Ligand binder design. Sequence first.
Ligand code: NA
Ligand code: NA
Ligand code: NA
Ligand code: NA
Ligand code: NA
Ligand code: NA
Ligand code: NA
Ligand code: NA
Ligand code: NA
Lengths: 177, 193, 177, 193, 177, 193
Amino acid sequence: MKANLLCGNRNLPKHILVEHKHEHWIGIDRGTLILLESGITPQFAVGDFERNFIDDTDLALGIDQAVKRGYRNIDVYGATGGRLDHFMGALQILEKPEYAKMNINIKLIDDTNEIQFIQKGQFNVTYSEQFPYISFIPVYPTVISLKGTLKLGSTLTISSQSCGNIEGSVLMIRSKD
Amino acid sequence: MKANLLCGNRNLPKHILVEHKHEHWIGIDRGTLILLESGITPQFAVGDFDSISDSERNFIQQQIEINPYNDDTDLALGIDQAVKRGYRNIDVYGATGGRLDHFMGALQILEKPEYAKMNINIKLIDDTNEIQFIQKGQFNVFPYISFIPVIPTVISLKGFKYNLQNELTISNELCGNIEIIEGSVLMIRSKDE
Amino acid sequence: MKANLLCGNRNLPKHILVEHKHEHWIGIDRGTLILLESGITPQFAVGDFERNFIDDTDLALGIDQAVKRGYRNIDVYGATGGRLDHFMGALQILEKPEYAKMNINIKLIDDTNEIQFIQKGQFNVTYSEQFPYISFIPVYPTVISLKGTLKLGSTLTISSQSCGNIEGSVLMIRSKD
Amino acid sequence: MKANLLCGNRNLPKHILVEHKHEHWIGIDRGTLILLESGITPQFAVGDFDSISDSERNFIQQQIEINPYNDDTDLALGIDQAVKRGYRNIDVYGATGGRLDHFMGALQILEKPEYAKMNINIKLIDDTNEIQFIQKGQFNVFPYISFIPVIPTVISLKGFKYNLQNELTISNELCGNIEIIEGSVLMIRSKDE
Amino acid sequence: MKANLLCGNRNLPKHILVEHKHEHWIGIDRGTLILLESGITPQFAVGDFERNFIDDTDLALGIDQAVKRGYRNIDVYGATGGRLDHFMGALQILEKPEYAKMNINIKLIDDTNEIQFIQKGQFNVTYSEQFPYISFIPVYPTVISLKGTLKLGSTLTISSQSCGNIEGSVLMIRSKD
Amino acid sequence: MKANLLCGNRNLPKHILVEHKHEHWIGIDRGTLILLESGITPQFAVGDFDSISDSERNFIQQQIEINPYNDDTDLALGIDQAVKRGYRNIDVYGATGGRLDHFMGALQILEKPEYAKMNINIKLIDDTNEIQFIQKGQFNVFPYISFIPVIPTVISLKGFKYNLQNELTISNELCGNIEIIEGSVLMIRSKDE
Ligand code: NA
Ligand code: NA
Ligand code: NA
Ligand code: NA
Ligand code: NA
Ligand code: NA
Ligand code: NA
Ligand code: NA
Ligand code: NA
């Protein structure tokens, strides 16, 4: 089951709320209000502006509840822009070791990016129409692909499928040109 | 048709918002924002409720906020407004604890005669109690049960004695009969804490 | 809360029923049938072709019930055209002294007009894109604006904001050119 | 699944259309137009019902009007048609007053054996009464209660005597037991007017 | 009342599921799944991939239940293409003598045809915009129109209204050019 | 909030899918496909369930199929997953007949202590029975009733004797009282076949 979380209205892909109006949506803080104003009933909501559902941030809470509720595909919207600590809080979540063993998939999506946390191992990467660039950001991580503090463009802006093997852990970022 | 009113977040039965998320909910004052925050759309709301942006207030004050003309408390209007829409069973949550002058006002509403003649069922509910008004007449049936007079002769059966008992049974424990020969009494059911 | 009343299908603004399909609608007489045929469930309906809700016309009844139900913004559609006594009955409503004290706002809207009853006092008037003309029709009413039985074009076809003060009462009509 | 049928506007419990506006409603003859007029969309309707324009009749006779093949009265078809869709609890309103030959036909339906074997619950209801058929067997439980035989031995408890009483109790007043040893009886509950 | 049956996804008129999303739909076998995937709740469904509703094929069952439920206008979609025995099974249904006496109307519709079983008697035929051709296929049937094993183009591809009288029984087929 | 679970098609009460077509349904293993086939959309489903095309599996495994992390049987996860969403009354259908080791596992779930403290009501149901767990305490109330101990002193009233009866009443026939002084018992109601 796929879960769509909305925790803001900044940088949202176009028509995301109308093209996906009948999917499972979850409100996070202010995202809840936006969903209601768009005629969408949230499966559940978290954060003020909730607590009786069932140390942590509202988004960490909402995602944890999604995971516990069996969702395997979790896409987070409205988590980039404005206050950046909120965006960093999101990246933290993706890193929780608890979501490592599980066969879960969480990603932050905005009108220009798609962020995922690729852990130690080997994964495949299919091409995409709107997302030409790919970049890996270590969270010592050594990697091997089909073309090969640290601040190098070595594993940044780069363009079937390919293999990505990590001999630590990184954040995979796909972005539009 | 059943309506649930939320007046705030004190002594609320745990999980009451998740367990009845699809029923009809009415927001009274602070209850309004708690409903929305839980992703619940109130059929309507009464109360000055705070806003954080025009986009919001515009939303709430056009599809949720009603403005009954009145005098009466926000809860009393919410009730009347629910009865006007055909709601027959009303459960008020969030009306206990804190400032007791309000809890008391909530009791005045249950006692309004305008509801006795009608076939309305109003109950105040929190995590430990259930309260309702019972007028002159005969009726049947939280291990504890108590009757408090409002304005009263009473006769009970399955509980204990009480025969033509004038107004004790301020904590009974019992498919049961109770007849109000005269006056009126509030019935309050409690759980064993 | 805003209430939308439908008591006919003549002169309705374009796409009013599809662009506003999720707002609060009230049926009045035949308007009820039109709403049902458009997939809209009326909050309530009045008039035959209802009475157990809760001397007067069906529309006076429906609007009175709206007012009693706390609606502050009431827009009436389908009240112009065809039988004119029905349109005049509508204008009567706007005039009820009962809706004077209250902070209510009622208006008749059709594809070309927007009629409101401005009572004794002083009100403001914002400009509008589709409605360039403004006209005041007394219901002895003396007025003072930003440009200044009786049948004069003095207070008729006339084009930020402006002040309208009434030293009796009039009907304000905004119409498209 | 519960279905309410409207056969007309006589002796209807006050506010029955507002108070149950969201339940499933079926229109029988004139009931059809009363439902719609109240802004209620019938799940389906039986009956020649009048029209005032093709636009309307087209609407009603394509999304509301069904045409069961039959013989049986319009109400009897409406019932069968509700049972075919899985409705187990049926409340018929509007079937009392006026021409009594119809009220009687409505009683014949409750007595159809085709419903005894099934687990259907059909009740006729108006502002003062509630009526249902009770077949051979034992069952339990408007201050007044009366039993009228249809084709009958009976035994009651909480009411009064009645022990192996052959077919009086045409106005009882009483969490109660009743056993039909033989035959069948209509049970009618009334209120104190 | 009109009933729409869906028992497949081959040769469906364009946008049938979106333009008619709010009408009464019935699922038949796989049609059920297609309806659910299109956001449509079937009044009821028949066939595996149901039986406790209330010798025969799932479509014969679904249509019989429609007829018993009082539907007078029954349009069948997705019954042409792929396995042809399934299409022939459909034609059989249209022929059931049981649906002769009744004032019922059943037809198979696809993006190019509209098939109906005209029995012994006399019927009228209105023109249509998208369907210019008409053809009659006997199911000894003698006919008389406004222009007049057997394998003749005499009563095939042929183009107000007209009269069609049958002095046995035939299948009327209207098709696009 | 009420949830119905379907685990398969054995001993199902006839018409259970048509009569409750609009309630909330959860699919467990084979129950999933039976729900869909009947044109019913499950709130969610647990179980490897078969597919016949990617289009389908994609559909089911994105809007219906959930994957709780676990160990526990598919039915036990379905239950927990329903309780997590706020479902308080759970009716499990399709869990009897066939391989009894499963029927037994279904009984273990009703006995989980994690549900005793909470205010959840889980019942196993088929065309002839209704089964539920009853913990230490006092409670009230298919002509046949039986109590089977799980881990037990008991006292019944309206049925027959049973006073401080230690753990017979493996087929009672009776607005009734039962108190578990010690231990726990499964209550099973049966119909007369
Ligand atoms: Na959920
Ligand atoms: Na109540
Ligand atoms: Na307190
Ligand atoms: Na309303
Ligand atoms: Na009933
Ligand atoms: Na009468
Ligand atoms: Na149907
Ligand atoms: Na249960
Ligand atoms: Na068995």
